[PDB]
Design a protein around this ligand. Structure first.
Ligand code: HEM
Ligand code: HEM
Ligand code: NIZ
Ligand code: NIZ
Ligand code: CL
Ligand code: CL
Ligand code: NA
Ligand code: NA
Lengths: 713, 713
């Protein structure tokens, strides 16, 4: 069946904005997962999971009689697809169960793990999402084996179709670097936003870089990919050594025995894959990765044996029965149990990537400290495991259930509790009138509030106007935020706030986070008034102001807009066309194509462009909220040509006279080009559309303002 | 970006069921196009369109000073993608403005036509859809040029993204037959459901089959493609000769002058394509197809000159300035006007496909009759043009506005008006009790109502339970409908009906159409009662019984289910896998993936399978409405394997004992295999889901029952 994608392989793909519709969702449109989960008897689930750990099923027998290792790996992989660059991946939408992740080579035999959990899923039904269950199971595994976890938050709602995520351009699973679609360039620089070394891996190749078993060089990849997953050196050592305290790898025989991944398997496989022809195909004969390593003498019990072994022995290179590189302790005693035969024991073994923890000089110092103080190791691993598995859950307000940790962590971008009465409608109207009487312009108010709100991304639910972090490092200095204009606006707002708060009785006051938003609302209302329309922009109070001390500046770097088509901003020159970046941004903002279209056309005429650029400002009444962008964009009286100076900027001239009327960017003109966006533009560009445009603008504006307001959910 | 479609190119694609969501739609959820159109001043639009016909724009100058020909071609093409095999294509969704149809070679320069309409679109806004405007503009063109149309109906709502239609497998535009993805096999047999000879054509190649200019062989393709678009010989001659009474083709210079189609063109082209490097690139220099033919001496006025010329001259093969085969009149004077230069005239010319109307012996007779009786020609063309442009509109109840023809036509599958009081809720309860007392089983009732309702397709809005056509030829005889069982059920229902109707006062009666449906509802209520659930199934009366004379039996043939996964039925062995045919069917029924899942799992346990097959009947309480399908399908205690007799049937055996528990087909097992369908199955298979299952089943049931009930909109 030949498709639009086959005929026009570089056209824009808008379907990414329209996933997750009510059509694909089996739950009623009123279904509220948070309220279902809040009534789940979580202790009862955890008792069932505890039982599970040691109830071996013959179709996938439990190593050492205990599924703990397998489930820890399953949870780790669920969380481990996470990239800080865009917030995509991670455990928070249960995407391990869909394509492609369910069939990634690094996820081999995690299909068995997920299937082991069906009876418990089935028992508790909609009160526990798969997403939450995968993470909970990991926790229970650790707990069953003697490890005290830091806590657990429910709240990850299930999703019903695969996400659209750029995982790389390679066309071959696990392709080595330096191919026609290499994710590496220069001096082993991994392309953003990727966070793994090969297509279908979680982070790194366990044999070493492109299969070279050099622990020192492997450590370089570990550090890079873990950093791209938001983990520093301490966290990375804790997580790796923590996880490889348990279980084993599977490599009983040659890898050519293993069949098709789940999405390529036959229908009879019922969603399972990697069927193995090697001996029994499971248990003692299992092949997953091809490595054959068991790290510890008690693979079902928390211990400090990983570091005891790592440091206690000297290691020699060897080959698994599948031929993969791995390490064995030279002439150790055979002290490591066999997973199925109680009369066999084995020597200590390690992956090349495990040895990285000892032979990378930075890791070695941390690893030694963990070896000599295994309580520090346990506390670090607990914290890191919580961070791993919760990193894409968003604000602490989404955390559910009785095991949520009380401690507030820096990585959570915490927002202080509000302890005082909030402003009401009359107060909001008085502030709005003050903001407008200060002489702040429509353009300044809208740009500031846009800049504050639009850092939100739905992928990991980081960002947004809550916190007033726009006033702090690093946001206040991002080029897209126009630091000098921003500083002037914030100064005037802060004076209005101080005066307002000083006049109150009874503890009422307004946060600057709220006022920035409210001022943006005044701006949009004044714009509408300039166009002759009386509208009220909805506003919900209750944002609070975070301090610089509660704001990790390095972690905030990834939220910087380098492309914001909504402000006609591109920080530099990229290989990805600007219109593609626009749609990506709209996806992170959770906008549909209609919402993206309305919003952009309104922002243009409000003066939200960075640097007061006239590109796409197709109106002779700037700062009035009108549909002029659309009417003028669609006017066939104008002819567009790319400029000689820049192929990415266009001049619009009167077709009859040649007179220069406007200039625009690819982001502006895509709305007159792409056949689906033009259809949208046409609706807003019609003579009956003025009222619709304003109402839809205000709605989407409001929506953007509220993206991070999970305190109100 | 490598996608799931690249990795697993033969997986099922469920996104086709979830297009056309609220997310992609710029109109509010409450927007009702019918009500907007009913307030449009249609007369005023038509005045504006009249004005347009002779308002020539410099960017695409009107031939002969009149755009009529162009707009007739535009409207023809809009309607001309229609296939009777699935009802997909046609004018009714305005899909000509989206990919791929906006960029089909046969639609070249229709982008200009559509752009000329923007001011009118813009003026009237949401009150007239593009879909309607394209056909209206065709009508006005004809009327402006002196042809009186049969009438016009509004009501085609706009759509907002491209449909997912199989247009063929070729990877090259216009590829000739016999390639690696040939749409032809055997003795020039065109593959169903296709209705064009080459990828990117409407029907046939104007130079002749695969470009060989044999009018007789061309006539074969014409007949086959037009038949696949629901037109017989009389209609086809009328339409072709009718249409080529107007306008001209465009072929002023070599085709290598013509640039990128709209979807490939630059952003600066603002949605237009085929920019030509030949001389001025437009007007007198225009290149569209490459042919250069002008059929009549008055290309802007209705005449009888097409047949005068066709029969009046003998024809010699020649070449256009682009090199295409075409025909010129032997010995003729230069009597055809030039489109731009009043001092030039040309000899009469014809396409190979025009000469088909004279050299095909069957077309010749029709053509001669039209020649000698031009009133018969005019009336046939009027009727055919109305049919062409309204064929996919569905029931007459959907027809809006003041130009709707009063005459009821056979091809509309008309439904007689209801002239008597309808049964009310007390009568419906009485009939249900009678149906249940008669001894008809749950399985009989559900199968019959399913068979009646499930002929509906949303593509052209044909089919459905309205009419009681299940009791007529050919439906009563379809294998999928189990003719023998059907005849017994209809006999018992007809007796219940006669008794009920005979007992009434005041003209009240119930149609068999309604009773079939109501009986289906009683069967579902009983099934629910068998399972311990107290369920009332919604019923809406008002169907009427159509007569055999109101039911064109040939036309009905295309509605025969050769694949109906909802009754585990496949009429033969096909190249397309059965699960693909299931999803296609669900798409025609307007079902989302959840709806398709719930519906199939319920039908299985209700006994709706053809021949009482046990395949997929995964319950020990058949005829009870339970979620057993799901719970049993997902039970990991069962292992599935294809049978030795048949690779498409599976045996499910107890994994521990080897005991045979169930058998199923690919349609059954796909719900436990495909990762998105399995996620749905899991909701319905959960321990808290029995009530949800029942309620969702009843909802989808009712939806299917009501699919053709446009009298209730
Ligand atoms: C550089 C990072 C990592 C590498 C390259 C890596 C590699 C691997 C490989 C190759 C296996 C064997 C899979 C198989 O054949 O069955 C595995 C197993 C395992 N890994 Fe990791 N790992 C890494 C980090 C982690 C982390 C962060 C955790 C959890 C905190 C984790 C926990 C596990 C566990 C529990 C298993 C045991 C599986 C079982 O018992 O079935 N690993 N690892
Ligand atoms: C065998 C069926 C047909 C064939 C092969 C065919 C072929 C063509 C071709 C090649 C053109 C020239 C396009 C160009 O270069 O601008 C055209 C023009 C046209 N056709 Fe057809 N045609 C078919 C049927 C129809 C029908 C059914 C209608 C309408 C009822 C129609 C109405 C027109 C009109 C009005 C034009 C003139 C366009 C103008 O003046 O710009 N044709 N046809
Ligand atoms: N791949 N997923 C995302 O980009 C996303 C998910 C949910 N809301 C916004 C964006
Ligand atoms: N491709 N188009 C269809 O299959 C369809 C369209 C509208 N309703 C149901 C089915
Ligand atoms: Cl994602
Ligand atoms: Cl279609
Ligand atoms: Na994410
Ligand atoms: Na259709």
């Amino acid at each position: 069946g030949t498709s639009n994608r086959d005929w026009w392989p570089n056209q824009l793909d808008l379907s990414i904005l329209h996933r997750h519709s009510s059509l694909s969702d089996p739950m009623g449109k009123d279904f509220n997962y948070a309220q279902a989960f809040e009534k789940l008897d979580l202790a009862a689930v955890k008792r069932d999971l505890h039982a599970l750990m040691t109830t071996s099923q013959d179709w996938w027998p439990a190593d050492f009689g205990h599924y703990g290792g397998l489930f820890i790996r399953m949870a780790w992989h669920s969380a481990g697809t996470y990239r800080t660059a865009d917030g995509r991946g991670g455990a928070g939408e249960g995407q391990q169960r869909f394509a492609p992740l369910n069939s990634w080579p690094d996820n081999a035999n995690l299909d068995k793990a997920r299937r082991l959990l069906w009876p418990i899923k089935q028992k508790y039904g909609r009160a526990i999402s798969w997403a939450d269950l995968l993470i909970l199971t990991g926790n229970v595994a650790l707990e069953s084996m003697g490890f005290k976890t830091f806590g657990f938050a429910g709240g990850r709602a299930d999703t019903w179709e695969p996400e659209d995520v750029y995982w790389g351009s390679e066309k071959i699973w696990l392709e080595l670097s330096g191919g026609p679609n290499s994710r590496y360039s220069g001096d082993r620089q991994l392309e953003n936003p990727l966070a793994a070394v090969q297509m279908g891996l979680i982070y790194v190749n366990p044999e070493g870089p492109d299969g070279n078993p050099d622990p020192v060089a492997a450590a370089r990849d570990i550090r890079d990919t873990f950093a791209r997953m938001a983990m520093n050196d301490e966290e990375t050592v804790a997580l790796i050594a923590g996880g490889h305290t348990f279980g084993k790898t599977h490599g009983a025989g040659p890898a050519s025995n293993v069949g098709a991944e789940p999405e390529a398997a036959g229908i009879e496989a019922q969603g399972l894959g990697w069927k193995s022809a090697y001996r029994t195909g499971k248990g003692a004969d299992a092949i997953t990765t091809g490595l054959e390593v068991t790290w510890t003498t008690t693979p079902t019990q928390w211990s400090h044996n990983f570091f005891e072994n790592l440091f206690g022995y000297e290691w020699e290179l060897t080959k698994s029965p599948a031929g993969a590189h791995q390490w064995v302790a030279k002439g150790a005693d055979a002290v490591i149990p066999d997973a199925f035969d109680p009369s066999k024991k084995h020597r200590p073994t390690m992956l090349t990537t495990d040895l990285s923890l000892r032979f990378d000089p930075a890791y070695e110092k941390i690893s030694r400290r963990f070896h000599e103080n295994p309580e520090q190791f346990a506390d670090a691993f607990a914290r890191a495991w919580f961070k791993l598995t919760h990193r894409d859950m968003g604000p602490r307000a989404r955390y559910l259930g009785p095991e949520v940790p009380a401690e507030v962590l820096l990585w959570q971008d915490p927002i202080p509790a509000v302890d005082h009465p909030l402003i009401d409608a009359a107060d909001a109207a008085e502030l709005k009138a003050k903001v407008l009487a200060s002489g702040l312009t429509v353009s300044q108010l809208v740009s500031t509030a846009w800049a504050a709100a639009s850092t939100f991304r739905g992928s990991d639910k980081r960002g947004g106007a809550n916190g007033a972090r726009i006033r702090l490092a690093p946001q206040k200095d991002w080029e897209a935020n126009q630091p000098e204009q921003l500083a002037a606006v914030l100064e005037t707002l802060e004076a209005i706030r101080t005066a307002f708060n000083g006049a109150q009785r009874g503890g009422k006051q307004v946060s600057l986070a709220d006022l920035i938003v409210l001022a943006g609302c005044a701006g949009v209302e004044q714009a509408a008034k300039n166009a002759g329309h009386a509208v009220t922009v909805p506003f919900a109070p209750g944002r609070a102001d975070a301090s610089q001390e509660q704001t990790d500046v390095e972690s905030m770097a990834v939220l910087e807009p380098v492309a914001d088509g909504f402000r006609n901003y591109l920080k530099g020159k990229y290989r990805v066309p600007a219109e593609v970046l626009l749609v990506d941004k709209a996806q992170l903002l959770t906008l549909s194509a209609p919402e993206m279209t309305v919003l952009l056309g309104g922002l243009r005429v409000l003066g939200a462009n960075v640097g007061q650029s006239r590109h796409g400002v197709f109106t002779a009444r700037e700062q009035a909220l009108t549909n002029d962008f659309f009417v003028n964009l669609l006017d066939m009286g104008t002819e567009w040509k790319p400029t000689a100076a820049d192929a990415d900027v266009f001049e619009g001239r009167d077709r009859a006279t040649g007179e220069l009327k406007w200039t625009g960017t690819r982001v502006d003109l895509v709305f007159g080009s792409h056949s689906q966006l033009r259809a949208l533009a046409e609706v807003y560009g019609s003579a009956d559309a003025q009222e619709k445009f304003v109402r839809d603008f205000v709605a989407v504006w409001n929506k953007v303002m509220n993206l991070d307001r999970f305190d109100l959910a």
